[PDB]
């Protein structure tokens, strides 16, 4: 299938094994901003669900399907590839909703549905939106969408902005410099120091931060889920040109995302911005191994390029330059191996 | 090979991927008890290495091979299956030891060595000794050992002892009781509460603890690596009969291990006991689903059975009984999915 072809089997088994556990579901369910905002988006847009046919892509425990049922959906196909499908089935029965919610075990790229749907609902967003490549599965599912069907969420905005955080920078640097030791119990480790540095700086940093570290207004990159195709997400090129508001060392770029549920009654936003209450997505920072000095009024331009790999992730290339001085930094990150700093 | 036959490929890819990272090596290297004890065992037993041929099974960064070289080894075959092999090669060159340390990329069950060796060195120990099944690879390597060759470690002692920890016990129910909610955003979750409880009780708990929780002297199970065969580790039956030193509720069994390097000059012990300074192995606790009351002077008997599986791990079965009252408990645990509580 389209899933097995883009996904090395060892990565797929690990991914679905992880989402099979109830403890993991509990952790996600306890994000009240996430769960409450989804419920509000669906219930306040009840006319988008009332007597409709719906597809829930990667339903997990089933909660979004339950919200669709509360909003009056006639039928909800709830697709789930992990063993969480069986637990969702238990909930559908114990909540007396077997007349409305039909769990379909398997990958959305592989199952067969009996009819086309009015609306697709999902939570495909990983860290910095793209982590884990579930957006592709969400877009793949549009093969089941009727003409003029809706998607919830409808659009995603990724935000990026340059930051200064000496302290985060020194922490990661200090760890790599363990390998600058000429006599670790008599052994010279220093030949591996560059490799060690590269490995640490390749890890995106998942945690939150004060907005005062941000040195320019964010640049926004939008994915319209109604219009994008799966293959659009294999290579994502995000140009940027920042007008620097503060002078200092730029240690990297910070990322967050918002999604909008554009319903008939209203648009509901779910934001993971650092100006908003914390979610289990936190925010993500990509460090530069060599920081860039810039003054307020300078332009910091470059490109953030995400290249999908078969480990169900992306290799991230970031090249940035201070236009006024020609100072450049170029950096590679492995979105599969984040540093969970919180 | 013997490795591929006992190990599902998806488990093997995940395992060697994990040991490929320098940060993981750094973590192990920074365990001073571990690294210092290995160095001391090798250097203080220099006559076991001086002008000898050695095999380092799973050499990682190469550190033990460097210690063998410091002790005078004539030649060291350093076998490693992860991409850490390439970093080891870099260190061998930068430490000017290419004439004495030969790095061999691959699994010890699959590579070919040109000659038999005087002594095998390794660090095959996982949590509770047996986690990750590397002891089998270590024993497999005795096909390369000369008659009367030595093994470093030599022997391993697994210790088990009953513990009381009411807060650890209750923590499982507190977490599972998230599911005991009749209207989580309108949804009755309660039907999943037993499944949640079951899931948490299958996870062995990796962390340390105060020795005051221990209710009896440990029972010891010894593997003599000079004498054991690979197949001895496929099914490990550990009977126990504890003479209780304290009255109270027994919530489960705690596990730790020691290994001894029995050299010609001296025996050096590496202990992960909770009476010793903490190592990166911590200790491990397996809960009983139902606690058992016992008085000081009673006997708590039963069996701990470890059954090797193709996920490169063990299913752990524990049955226990207070002889004087006939009160019995069991559990089944999955050593592949430990709870890292530290
Ligand atoms: N192709 C596929 N076919 C069928 N099923 C798929 C496919 N792909 C993934 N699945 C399942 O979709 C579920 C994913 N969840 C993950 C939630 C968002 N992800 C995050 C969030 C934060 C950080 C990182 N990641 C969606 C939310 C759902 N409403 C729920 O309640 O979980 C998991 O159970 C997955 O197994
Ligand atoms: N069949 C095999 N063929 C060839 N190579 C194998 C095989 N199997 C495993 N390897 C390698 O052995 C290395 C593992 N050891 C670390 C083991 C510790 N494990 C723990 C520790 C704590 C908790 C849990 N687990 C490195 C020690 C080395 N002396 C050094 O100091 O770096 C890793 O590089 C593995 O890839």
XYZ file of C-alpha atoms and ligand atoms in Angstrom:
756
model
C 0.000 0.000 0.000
C 0.912 3.713 0.018
C 1.724 3.287 3.747
C 4.032 0.225 3.522
C 5.797 1.781 0.498
C 6.711 5.000 2.405
C 7.406 3.200 5.715
C 10.121 0.754 6.646
C 8.398 -2.118 8.470
C 10.505 -1.839 11.644
C 9.429 1.827 12.008
C 5.756 0.962 11.392
C 5.719 -1.867 13.975
C 7.319 0.414 16.572
C 4.861 3.271 15.826
C 1.671 1.202 16.085
C 3.035 -0.718 19.090
C 3.510 2.622 20.913
C -0.035 3.842 20.176
C -1.449 0.488 21.341
C -0.972 1.375 25.041
C -3.680 2.841 27.244
C -1.113 4.858 29.272
C -0.156 6.707 26.139
C -3.809 7.471 25.392
C -4.278 8.687 28.930
C -1.379 11.131 28.515
C -2.859 12.590 25.316
C -6.393 12.690 26.675
C -5.210 14.705 29.677
C -4.220 17.596 27.423
C -7.323 19.664 28.147
C -6.548 22.393 25.583
C -6.339 19.722 22.897
C -9.382 17.713 23.927
C -11.547 20.722 24.859
C -10.734 22.596 21.650
C -11.562 19.577 19.458
C -14.863 19.114 21.307
C -15.694 22.809 20.914
C -14.816 22.777 17.162
C -17.094 19.812 16.522
C -20.000 20.735 18.833
C -20.142 24.419 17.897
C -20.220 23.278 14.233
C -22.999 20.688 14.825
C -24.534 21.420 11.405
C -21.373 19.997 9.779
C -22.108 16.682 11.551
C -25.900 16.460 12.006
C -27.026 13.374 10.019
C -23.704 13.197 8.161
C -21.312 10.388 7.332
C -17.886 10.842 8.880
C -14.435 9.313 8.755
C -12.165 9.523 11.853
C -8.625 8.871 10.617
C -6.574 7.215 13.386
C -9.329 7.298 15.977
C -7.208 5.898 18.853
C -9.479 5.662 21.918
C -12.327 7.073 19.836
C -12.897 10.430 21.497
C -13.311 12.496 18.295
C -15.799 9.945 16.972
C -17.720 10.322 20.229
C -17.758 14.084 19.685
C -19.064 13.596 16.139
C -21.801 11.348 17.590
C -22.692 13.982 20.247
C -23.050 16.458 17.324
C -25.592 14.171 15.543
C -23.565 12.204 12.968
C -25.589 9.442 11.343
C -22.541 7.217 10.856
C -18.867 7.464 11.771
C -16.237 5.118 10.362
C -13.466 5.125 12.939
C -10.230 3.818 11.434
C -7.355 2.680 13.624
C -4.347 0.498 12.896
C -3.022 -0.227 16.419
C -4.547 -2.594 18.964
C -6.177 0.565 20.415
C -8.968 -0.310 17.929
C -10.187 -3.058 20.243
C -10.361 -0.680 23.233
C -12.269 1.860 21.111
C -14.757 -0.910 20.267
C -15.240 -1.618 23.990
C -16.060 2.085 24.552
C -18.491 2.253 21.628
C -20.431 -0.659 23.122
C -20.337 0.566 26.719
C -21.537 4.001 25.574
C -24.415 2.424 23.568
C -23.252 3.991 20.296
C -22.967 0.881 18.092
C -25.715 2.354 15.898
C -23.457 5.324 15.049
C -19.765 4.477 15.396
C -18.189 1.715 13.369
C -14.597 0.884 14.205
C -12.574 -0.313 11.184
C -9.303 -1.931 12.183
C -6.366 -1.282 9.840
C -4.422 1.449 8.084
C -6.447 4.116 6.276
C -4.296 3.411 3.208
C -5.375 -0.274 3.277
C -8.942 -0.620 4.570
C -12.037 -0.595 2.379
C -14.972 1.683 3.352
C -18.487 1.012 2.120
C -19.278 4.612 1.155
C -17.890 8.129 0.683
C -18.051 10.591 3.567
C -19.193 14.173 4.171
C -16.365 15.130 6.532
C -13.034 13.785 7.722
C -11.846 14.347 11.250
C -8.407 13.590 12.665
C -5.575 14.637 14.931
C -2.609 14.024 12.609
C -0.332 16.730 14.058
C 3.021 15.821 15.562
C 5.687 18.101 17.058
C 6.208 21.070 14.675
C 3.196 19.706 12.862
C 5.051 17.272 10.613
C 6.639 14.852 13.127
C 5.548 11.181 12.537
C 4.156 11.851 9.015
C 0.530 11.228 9.915
C -0.504 14.288 7.810
C 0.043 12.114 4.724
C -2.413 9.498 5.954
C -4.921 12.262 6.698
C -4.570 13.617 3.136
C -4.609 10.085 1.661
C -8.033 9.650 3.256
C -9.510 12.303 0.913
C -10.051 9.461 -1.556
C -13.136 8.787 0.607
C -14.297 12.407 0.742
C -17.314 13.517 -1.275
C -16.934 16.537 -3.586
C -17.109 19.595 -1.326
C -16.651 17.490 1.804
C -14.898 19.181 4.713
C -11.737 18.407 6.716
C -11.388 19.013 10.452
C -8.778 20.371 10.876
C -9.060 22.296 7.594
C -5.728 24.173 7.561
C -2.414 24.109 9.478
C -0.061 27.098 9.946
C 3.521 26.381 10.896
C 5.258 29.347 12.505
C 9.003 29.888 12.630
C 11.063 32.574 14.320
C 14.723 33.117 15.245
C 15.597 32.846 18.964
C 18.440 33.612 21.358
C 19.029 31.199 24.257
C 22.553 30.901 25.467
C 21.923 28.354 28.195
C 20.087 26.028 25.824
C 23.011 26.416 23.446
C 25.619 25.793 26.172
C 23.772 22.813 27.617
C 23.870 20.937 24.291
C 27.453 22.087 23.605
C 28.598 21.098 27.059
C 27.244 17.604 26.513
C 29.100 17.097 23.225
C 32.355 18.345 24.733
C 32.506 15.214 26.881
C 34.062 13.809 23.690
C 36.810 16.466 23.817
C 38.710 14.362 26.367
C 42.242 13.258 25.632
C 42.400 10.813 28.544
C 39.102 9.363 29.583
C 40.425 6.548 31.796
C 43.515 6.724 29.576
C 41.671 6.854 26.252
C 41.649 9.740 23.809
C 38.067 10.324 22.723
C 38.680 13.597 20.852
C 38.541 12.146 17.309
C 34.800 11.628 17.855
C 34.032 15.092 19.149
C 32.732 16.410 15.801
C 30.500 13.381 15.387
C 29.192 13.852 18.921
C 28.443 17.540 18.350
C 26.651 16.762 15.121
C 24.539 14.147 16.852
C 23.401 16.446 19.692
C 22.726 19.467 17.446
C 20.781 17.227 15.098
C 18.132 16.753 17.814
C 15.254 19.173 17.790
C 14.537 20.460 21.310
C 10.966 19.885 22.461
C 10.005 22.138 25.349
C 8.444 25.505 26.011
C 10.071 28.904 26.502
C 9.398 32.548 27.231
C 8.492 34.601 24.121
C 11.196 37.108 25.100
C 13.774 34.813 23.455
C 12.232 35.539 20.016
C 14.166 38.070 17.935
C 11.725 38.679 15.073
C 8.095 38.237 14.155
C 7.274 34.693 13.016
C 6.984 33.683 9.400
C 3.958 31.511 8.607
C 3.713 28.557 6.248
C 0.227 27.234 5.546
C -0.952 23.811 4.485
C -4.528 23.806 3.237
C -5.726 20.221 3.944
C -8.648 20.591 1.526
C -6.209 21.202 -1.341
C -2.890 19.504 -0.521
C -1.972 16.078 -1.865
C 0.014 13.442 0.013
C 3.012 13.876 -2.220
C 3.205 17.575 -1.371
C 4.467 16.451 2.047
C 7.409 14.376 0.834
C 9.450 17.575 0.313
C 8.473 20.751 2.152
C 10.355 23.959 1.275
C 9.793 26.879 3.687
C 11.572 30.081 2.629
C 11.949 32.806 5.232
C 13.095 36.381 5.476
C 13.075 37.777 9.047
C 13.345 41.468 9.886
C 15.280 41.348 13.144
C 13.675 43.276 16.022
C 16.550 42.711 18.509
C 20.338 42.634 18.263
C 22.173 39.533 19.510
C 23.180 35.950 18.797
C 20.656 33.840 16.918
C 21.016 30.322 18.330
C 18.405 28.812 16.004
C 14.797 28.745 14.864
C 11.717 28.076 17.008
C 8.660 26.321 15.549
C 5.060 26.012 16.567
C 1.762 25.453 14.786
C -1.908 26.353 14.754
C -4.742 24.449 13.086
C -8.167 25.904 12.217
C -11.433 23.996 12.044
C -13.323 26.040 9.438
C -16.938 25.050 10.071
C -20.251 26.371 8.741
C -21.128 28.062 12.045
C -17.622 29.197 13.064
C -13.876 28.802 12.801
C -12.192 27.347 15.902
C -8.405 27.641 16.275
C -6.147 25.221 18.183
C -2.839 27.030 18.785
C 0.413 25.607 20.168
C 2.030 29.068 20.157
C 4.266 30.085 23.094
C 1.896 33.008 23.722
C -0.894 30.435 24.353
C -1.423 27.894 27.099
C 0.897 24.941 26.985
C -0.187 21.784 25.098
C 1.452 18.355 24.919
C 2.994 19.545 21.619
C 5.057 22.153 23.495
C 7.177 23.986 20.902
C 10.277 22.945 19.002
C 13.669 24.579 18.646
C 16.298 23.749 16.104
C 19.732 24.863 17.172
C 22.461 26.177 14.937
C 25.814 24.555 15.709
C 27.394 27.962 15.003
C 25.175 30.865 16.027
C 24.745 34.048 13.954
C 25.176 37.621 15.184
C 22.619 40.107 13.874
C 21.531 43.663 14.713
C 18.012 44.938 14.951
C 17.014 46.044 11.439
C 19.029 43.279 9.714
C 17.449 40.619 7.510
C 17.890 36.934 8.322
C 16.904 34.884 5.296
C 17.127 31.310 4.198
C 15.211 28.099 3.782
C 13.909 25.311 5.910
C 13.635 22.112 3.855
C 11.951 18.936 5.131
C 12.691 15.765 3.273
C 10.600 12.733 4.167
C 12.485 9.516 5.000
C 11.384 5.865 5.305
C 11.775 5.938 9.108
C 8.394 7.727 9.173
C 10.106 11.047 9.690
C 11.951 13.984 8.108
C 15.481 15.132 7.649
C 15.403 18.876 8.198
C 17.825 21.160 6.431
C 18.072 24.755 7.660
C 20.271 27.317 5.950
C 20.227 30.878 7.190
C 22.143 33.984 6.402
C 22.409 37.516 7.745
C 22.093 39.487 4.523
C 23.989 42.548 5.704
C 27.158 40.612 6.606
C 26.992 37.400 4.591
C 27.278 35.316 7.785
C 25.794 31.868 7.086
C 24.771 28.848 9.120
C 23.557 25.580 7.675
C 22.280 22.767 9.755
C 20.778 19.287 9.511
C 18.306 17.841 11.996
C 16.776 14.457 12.498
C 13.147 14.912 13.498
C 12.973 11.223 14.510
C 15.345 11.817 17.497
C 14.079 14.852 19.445
C 15.461 15.918 22.821
C 12.523 15.999 25.257
C 13.851 18.723 27.526
C 10.633 19.476 29.568
C 22.313 -17.521 12.296
C 21.683 -18.254 15.994
C 20.934 -14.513 16.411
C 18.411 -14.089 13.553
C 16.685 -17.346 14.596
C 16.052 -16.108 18.181
C 15.322 -12.475 17.158
C 12.519 -11.004 15.100
C 14.102 -8.571 12.611
C 12.059 -5.545 13.732
C 13.345 -6.044 17.311
C 16.939 -6.390 16.091
C 16.756 -3.195 13.933
C 15.381 -1.231 16.916
C 18.045 -2.615 19.295
C 21.086 -1.891 17.118
C 19.663 1.504 16.117
C 19.537 2.443 19.834
C 23.176 1.404 20.476
C 24.298 3.345 17.408
C 24.056 6.706 19.269
C 27.015 8.425 20.898
C 24.746 9.896 23.623
C 23.891 6.391 24.741
C 27.591 5.526 24.935
C 28.230 8.705 26.868
C 25.571 7.751 29.427
C 27.209 4.370 30.021
C 30.721 5.839 30.058
C 29.671 8.375 32.739
C 28.590 5.573 35.056
C 31.814 5.646 37.051
C 31.086 2.449 39.016
C 30.627 0.573 35.747
C 33.562 2.032 33.850
C 35.962 2.180 36.789
C 35.186 -1.373 37.907
C 35.753 -2.814 34.423
C 39.060 -0.964 34.139
C 40.170 -2.128 37.576
C 39.188 -5.778 36.883
C 41.248 -5.809 33.679
C 44.278 -3.786 34.863
C 44.629 -5.475 38.269
C 44.507 -8.836 36.404
C 47.163 -7.804 33.832
C 48.597 -11.347 33.700
C 45.287 -12.524 32.191
C 45.874 -10.066 29.295
C 49.643 -9.601 28.882
C 50.518 -10.932 25.396
C 47.138 -12.672 25.077
C 44.541 -12.872 22.319
C 41.199 -11.388 23.316
C 37.644 -11.141 22.027
C 35.476 -8.131 23.039
C 31.859 -9.118 22.431
C 29.794 -6.016 21.592
C 32.656 -3.559 21.956
C 30.532 -0.410 21.463
C 32.918 2.589 21.605
C 35.781 0.177 22.284
C 36.575 1.114 25.872
C 37.084 -2.448 27.195
C 39.327 -3.254 24.242
C 41.373 -0.162 25.160
C 41.631 -1.469 28.725
C 42.786 -4.863 27.392
C 45.404 -2.998 25.327
C 46.538 -0.992 28.416
C 46.949 -4.383 30.172
C 49.275 -5.698 27.397
C 47.056 -7.775 25.072
C 48.834 -8.845 21.896
C 45.643 -8.837 19.817
C 42.025 -7.879 20.482
C 39.128 -8.753 18.146
C 36.451 -6.177 18.867
C 33.035 -7.240 17.545
C 30.124 -4.802 17.242
C 26.888 -4.981 15.257
C 25.628 -1.362 15.452
C 27.008 1.634 13.558
C 28.999 2.301 16.769
C 31.580 0.015 15.071
C 32.614 2.872 12.791
C 33.194 5.198 15.774
C 35.235 2.462 17.479
C 37.385 2.201 14.315
C 38.004 5.982 14.487
C 39.174 5.653 18.118
C 41.452 2.698 17.385
C 43.208 4.778 14.723
C 43.409 7.984 16.746
C 44.830 6.025 19.697
C 47.462 4.377 17.420
C 46.297 0.822 18.161
C 45.516 -0.492 14.637
C 48.270 -3.082 15.102
C 46.532 -4.494 18.234
C 42.770 -3.876 18.072
C 40.817 -5.223 15.129
C 37.251 -3.978 14.933
C 34.925 -6.480 13.212
C 31.540 -5.081 12.256
C 28.653 -7.553 12.636
C 26.968 -9.901 15.077
C 29.205 -12.296 17.027
C 26.934 -15.137 15.865
C 27.654 -14.246 12.205
C 31.209 -12.925 11.872
C 34.225 -15.135 11.333
C 37.344 -14.791 13.545
C 40.724 -15.980 12.319
C 41.793 -17.619 15.588
C 40.787 -18.862 19.020
C 41.206 -16.541 21.982
C 42.594 -16.703 25.522
C 39.910 -14.553 27.127
C 36.526 -13.066 26.284
C 35.483 -9.709 27.650
C 32.037 -8.137 27.467
C 29.331 -6.086 29.126
C 26.254 -8.166 28.266
C 24.186 -7.214 31.343
C 20.803 -5.531 30.986
C 18.331 -4.483 33.710
C 17.893 -7.437 36.150
C 20.824 -8.949 34.257
C 18.780 -10.669 31.571
C 17.029 -7.730 29.849
C 17.848 -7.616 26.076
C 19.247 -11.201 25.961
C 22.853 -10.233 25.251
C 24.106 -12.912 27.722
C 23.306 -15.490 25.025
C 25.606 -13.751 22.536
C 28.318 -13.663 25.197
C 27.957 -17.425 25.796
C 27.717 -18.112 22.052
C 31.145 -16.532 21.705
C 32.724 -19.415 23.701
C 32.990 -21.220 20.364
C 36.087 -19.017 19.942
C 37.507 -19.651 23.419
C 40.565 -21.862 23.888
C 40.310 -24.783 26.342
C 40.660 -23.234 29.799
C 40.245 -19.701 28.422
C 38.694 -17.160 30.788
C 35.540 -14.991 30.658
C 35.312 -11.452 32.054
C 32.818 -11.269 33.651
C 33.097 -14.966 34.719
C 29.917 -15.222 36.870
C 26.647 -13.284 37.357
C 24.411 -13.370 40.445
C 20.829 -12.208 40.164
C 19.331 -11.237 43.515
C 15.625 -11.203 44.326
C 13.940 -10.050 47.515
C 10.371 -9.282 48.590
C 9.471 -5.619 49.174
C 6.717 -3.517 50.717
C 5.861 -0.253 48.942
C 2.340 0.885 49.459
C 2.736 4.102 47.478
C 4.112 2.285 44.443
C 1.288 -0.206 44.668
C -1.409 2.491 44.923
C 0.109 4.590 42.150
C -1.027 1.926 39.645
C -4.654 2.343 40.661
C -4.411 6.091 40.786
C -3.179 6.124 37.197
C -5.698 3.556 35.965
C -8.529 5.446 37.706
C -8.276 8.130 35.055
C -10.481 5.683 33.130
C -13.031 5.473 35.975
C -14.936 8.525 34.790
C -18.513 8.307 33.597
C -18.415 11.555 31.610
C -15.035 12.514 30.270
C -16.205 15.249 27.884
C -19.471 13.321 27.721
C -17.929 9.869 27.323
C -18.058 7.003 29.818
C -14.533 5.631 30.018
C -15.048 3.174 32.852
C -15.134 -0.060 30.831
C -11.397 0.340 30.151
C -10.278 0.706 33.747
C -9.437 -3.001 34.260
C -7.474 -3.096 31.017
C -5.516 -0.060 32.182
C -4.746 -1.690 35.541
C -3.619 -4.875 33.824
C -1.333 -2.939 31.526
C 0.478 -1.087 34.334
C 0.987 -4.293 36.355
C 2.690 -6.017 33.384
C 5.501 -3.396 33.378
C 8.537 -4.003 35.560
C 9.528 -0.801 37.364
C 13.073 0.412 36.753
C 14.227 2.775 39.466
C 16.031 2.763 42.765
C 14.658 2.633 46.295
C 15.563 2.725 49.948
C 16.678 -0.660 51.355
C 14.133 -0.280 54.163
C 11.447 -1.577 51.790
C 13.131 -5.021 51.679
C 11.486 -7.627 53.906
C 13.927 -10.535 53.646
C 17.446 -11.411 52.705
C 17.808 -11.804 48.937
C 17.882 -15.151 47.236
C 20.673 -15.516 44.704
C 20.647 -17.221 41.332
C 24.047 -17.712 39.743
C 25.068 -18.113 36.140
C 28.620 -19.401 35.750
C 29.615 -18.043 32.299
C 32.525 -20.502 32.023
C 30.071 -23.406 32.248
C 26.704 -22.193 30.944
C 25.409 -22.846 27.464
C 23.302 -20.394 25.457
C 20.297 -22.653 25.807
C 20.431 -22.432 29.589
C 19.120 -18.878 29.188
C 16.004 -19.666 27.126
C 14.102 -20.731 30.263
C 15.338 -19.480 33.619
C 13.621 -21.002 36.642
C 14.431 -19.252 39.904
C 12.873 -20.952 42.907
C 12.796 -18.970 46.109
C 12.015 -19.503 49.725
C 12.306 -16.257 51.727
C 12.545 -16.276 55.500
C 10.731 -13.036 56.282
C 12.643 -10.580 58.499
C 9.736 -8.085 58.837
C 5.968 -8.383 59.176
C 3.779 -6.556 56.637
C 2.305 -6.536 53.137
C 4.537 -7.904 50.377
C 3.803 -5.886 47.223
C 6.259 -7.760 44.952
C 9.842 -8.744 44.242
C 12.889 -6.511 43.756
C 15.762 -7.569 41.481
C 19.378 -6.556 41.156
C 22.630 -8.212 40.075
C 26.346 -8.562 40.705
C 29.036 -9.873 38.335
C 32.527 -11.091 39.329
C 35.689 -10.913 37.253
C 37.628 -13.920 38.561
C 41.189 -13.202 37.458
C 44.508 -14.871 38.268
C 45.597 -12.026 40.560
C 42.210 -11.127 42.091
C 38.440 -11.259 41.920
C 36.768 -7.895 41.278
C 33.012 -7.509 41.871
C 30.645 -5.085 40.113
C 27.437 -4.726 42.160
C 24.143 -3.009 41.237
C 22.664 -3.680 44.689
C 20.531 -0.980 46.398
C 23.051 -0.998 49.262
C 25.724 0.142 46.733
C 26.092 3.379 44.814
C 23.576 3.776 42.038
C 24.493 2.551 38.527
C 22.775 3.118 35.163
C 21.157 -0.319 35.753
C 19.239 0.984 38.785
C 17.191 -1.917 40.181
C 13.943 -3.541 39.039
C 10.649 -4.207 40.824
C 7.864 -6.504 39.730
C 4.553 -5.969 41.477
C 2.031 -8.506 42.634
C -1.537 -7.813 41.563
C -2.630 -8.849 45.056
C -0.352 -8.138 48.011
C 0.463 -10.866 50.534
C 0.501 -10.445 54.304
C 3.337 -12.204 56.108
C 4.862 -12.090 59.595
C 8.519 -12.064 60.438
C 9.618 -15.711 60.639
C 7.157 -16.889 57.926
C 8.295 -18.401 54.645
C 7.402 -16.821 51.316
C 8.074 -19.349 48.584
C 7.478 -19.639 44.887
C 9.131 -19.333 41.514
C 10.249 -16.685 39.148
C 10.264 -18.056 35.609
C 11.799 -16.169 32.695
C 10.827 -17.395 29.298
C 12.752 -16.024 26.357
C 10.700 -14.600 23.465
C 11.511 -13.521 19.895
C 11.197 -9.811 20.788
C 14.717 -10.166 22.251
C 13.281 -10.314 25.733
C 11.563 -12.361 28.432
C 8.086 -12.999 29.701
C 8.336 -13.085 33.469
C 6.038 -15.297 35.478
C 6.023 -14.920 39.261
C 4.032 -17.067 41.658
C 4.384 -16.685 45.398
C 2.809 -18.086 48.486
C 3.010 -17.509 52.236
C 3.455 -21.073 53.457
C 1.976 -20.549 56.912
C -1.341 -19.136 55.604
C -1.668 -20.491 52.069
C -2.097 -16.950 50.677
C -1.028 -16.956 47.007
C -0.294 -14.368 44.346
C 0.967 -14.289 40.815
C 1.967 -11.895 38.103
C 2.960 -11.980 34.446
C 5.267 -9.229 33.231
C 6.742 -8.116 29.960
C 10.451 -7.296 30.426
C 10.456 -5.631 26.982
C 8.153 -2.805 28.237
C 9.602 -1.583 31.533
C 8.366 1.551 33.283
C 11.313 3.949 33.649
C 10.165 5.611 36.858
C 13.455 7.454 37.776
N -2.359 5.364 8.657
C -3.108 5.125 9.843
N -4.157 4.349 9.797
C -4.856 4.114 10.854
N -4.552 4.631 11.997
C -3.495 5.431 12.120
C -2.742 5.705 11.047
N -1.752 6.514 11.449
C -1.893 6.749 12.739
N -2.951 6.076 13.162
C -3.477 6.066 14.473
O -3.876 7.229 14.649
C -3.698 7.534 16.093
C -2.981 8.713 16.152
N -3.416 9.636 17.226
C -2.166 10.424 17.466
C -2.455 11.850 17.999
C -1.592 12.986 17.411
N -0.179 12.663 17.267
C 0.832 13.304 18.131
C 0.421 14.210 19.109
C 1.375 14.813 19.922
C 2.701 14.474 19.729
C 3.045 13.563 18.719
N 2.112 13.016 17.950
C -4.493 10.475 16.592
C -5.505 11.094 17.615
C -6.783 10.286 17.927
N -7.927 11.143 17.910
C -6.531 9.734 19.286
O -7.381 9.731 20.168
O -5.423 9.266 19.503
C -2.795 6.387 16.636
O -3.642 5.575 17.557
C -2.352 5.826 15.625
O -2.096 4.417 15.769
N 25.030 -10.154 18.922
C 25.851 -8.994 18.991
N 26.875 -8.907 18.173
C 27.653 -7.865 18.187
N 27.460 -6.882 19.001
C 26.441 -6.894 19.863
C 25.603 -7.949 19.890
N 24.684 -7.693 20.842
C 24.955 -6.519 21.383
N 26.024 -6.013 20.797
C 26.661 -4.767 21.119
O 26.997 -4.806 22.328
C 27.023 -3.391 22.814
C 26.370 -3.277 24.026
N 27.243 -2.964 25.176
C 26.426 -2.267 26.197
C 25.478 -3.268 26.935
C 24.763 -2.641 28.146
N 23.338 -2.872 27.996
C 22.427 -2.313 28.988
C 22.983 -1.589 30.032
C 22.113 -1.049 30.967
C 20.760 -1.269 30.797
C 20.278 -2.016 29.714
N 21.127 -2.514 28.844
C 28.384 -2.060 24.813
C 29.473 -2.262 25.910
C 30.882 -2.001 25.360
N 31.808 -2.837 26.054
C 31.238 -0.563 25.611
O 31.889 -0.260 26.610
O 30.879 0.314 24.830
C 26.167 -2.617 21.764
O 27.127 -1.730 21.039
C 25.626 -3.509 21.080
O 25.365 -3.164 19.697
